[PDB]
Write a protein that binds this ligand. Sequence first.
Ligand SMILES: [Zn+2]
Ligand SMILES: [Zn+2]
Ligand SMILES: [Zn+2]
Lengths: 108, 46, 64, 300, 59
Amino acid sequence: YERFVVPEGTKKVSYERDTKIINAASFTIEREDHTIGNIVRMQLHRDENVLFAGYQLPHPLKYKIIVRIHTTSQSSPMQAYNQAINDLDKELDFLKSQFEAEVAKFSN
Amino acid sequence: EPVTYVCGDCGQENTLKSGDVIQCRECGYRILYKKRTRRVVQYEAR
Amino acid sequence: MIIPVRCFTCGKVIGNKWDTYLDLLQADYTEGDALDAIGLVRYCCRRMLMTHVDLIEKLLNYNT
Amino acid sequence: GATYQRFPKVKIRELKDDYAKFELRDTDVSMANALRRVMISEVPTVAIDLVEIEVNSSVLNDEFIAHRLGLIPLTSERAMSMRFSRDCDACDGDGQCEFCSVEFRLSAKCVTDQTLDVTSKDLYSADPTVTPVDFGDSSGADSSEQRGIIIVKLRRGQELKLRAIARKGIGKDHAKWSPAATVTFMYEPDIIINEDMMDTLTDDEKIDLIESSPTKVFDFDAVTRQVVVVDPEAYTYDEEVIKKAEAMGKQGLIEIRPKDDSFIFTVESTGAVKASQLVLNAIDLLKQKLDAVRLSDDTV
Amino acid sequence: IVQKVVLSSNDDGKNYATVSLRQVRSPCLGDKFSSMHGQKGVLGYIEEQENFAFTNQGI
Ligand SMILES: [Zn+2]
Ligand SMILES: [Zn+2]
Ligand SMILES: [Zn+2]
């Protein structure tokens, strides 16, 4: 119904460049929960040039995430954000490969 | 269908007409339920 | 009234296990041995079978 | 674009049609929790979603019967390729369709004096052999009772004619679509029991502090007078053993540390979907969700 | 939803009419509950399943 995926007239992800601090932005993601925000922030903490990775829900009844990234120079929020998403996608590839391998050892 | 009212202890369909004294014929008891006709009804399994 | 499908806490389907539960208690088993025979390991389902009140029979007798 | 990528490992202990256990390691806790939450609430399943009752003359009511029909599990192996019925161009006729909206039928009546009960095996499905009612709890498994899920019981002048329409949904809309019925994981402990403190204290104290454990974790090897961890995976993190070691004042005796990796899953299923199919659909829906949130279009 | 219609009367013809409606309610966010020990409350927050704390059996 309307609780699920974002209707027409609103983006899925809305970017916002923070004003008062250099190397700082706030990614306001629609239609999510702790599932994606948690794995995104814990992938961000394994990076070198990142400084601050968190998410919070502006009301616990409403179904959206706001993520914040403070980074150093030699990078940006955009670079480390897309680095996080792509490396999580690669790990899900390698995990699906391992699981479909291990299913085959129940050989029928 | 007509109204087709059902008695309480007879079980017989009197098929009542315009307002008399409420009293089941073939007897004297005065219960007179109303029969459910054959319709459709919509429900959400929730 | 009838046994509920889907044990309220976890979600295992228990809606078919009622008559075999009555038969296992009918034979000679106690309730722990019966629930271990049907294979219900967590207590969220055991509390759902041991405390069920079956009221459909009293309704079937009082209709006509 | 550096590496920034950790390499998981899977090793399966047991695997049956509706059960699994695998020792996932070298991944973080949040990934395991993501797999758990997707398998409980995100993976879709076909279930009954609409009921038209033509005749009902039993002692139960309409919403009770519709509520029991909503919870009967249907086999959902074409549900990943079906579509949400709000997203279908066709099928605006409250009936059968081919990408959603399987239609069912049910009629039963008793003319004997033997108290006929209406079970799940009286639901006859149009669009057959793809979404029937589930039978694995009856046949192919000698678990409890082949009669299946009882819906109503009836007498002579009693009948029940209806027509149900199944659809597609996920567990966040209602509990009837969640195919999990158990999804959980746990850590696994690192137990580093000292041997130069264990030979100090006496044999009655040995057999006492082994006895204080509520699960059989340790074992008493009487032939060498020593103790032995025989099952780490039954430790439940309640500290009663180390608390009695504290009350006995022998510190540095045993220490127990949960390892950062090594997440032992335990996956069950209602029988609508197989277990390995649940894990693979979870990984695929995580990839679809990670796909739909990229800002790759505008780099600057 | 209408459940039944009952039409009775009295000795001096005083015709009586009875109509019963039916409803199904799930407990909403304002309802009151209690234990067996005089410890009552109001349901204030209905929470989805995967956010509760779970034990090693998954309860
Ligand atoms: Zn009469
Ligand atoms: Zn359970
Ligand atoms: Zn359609």
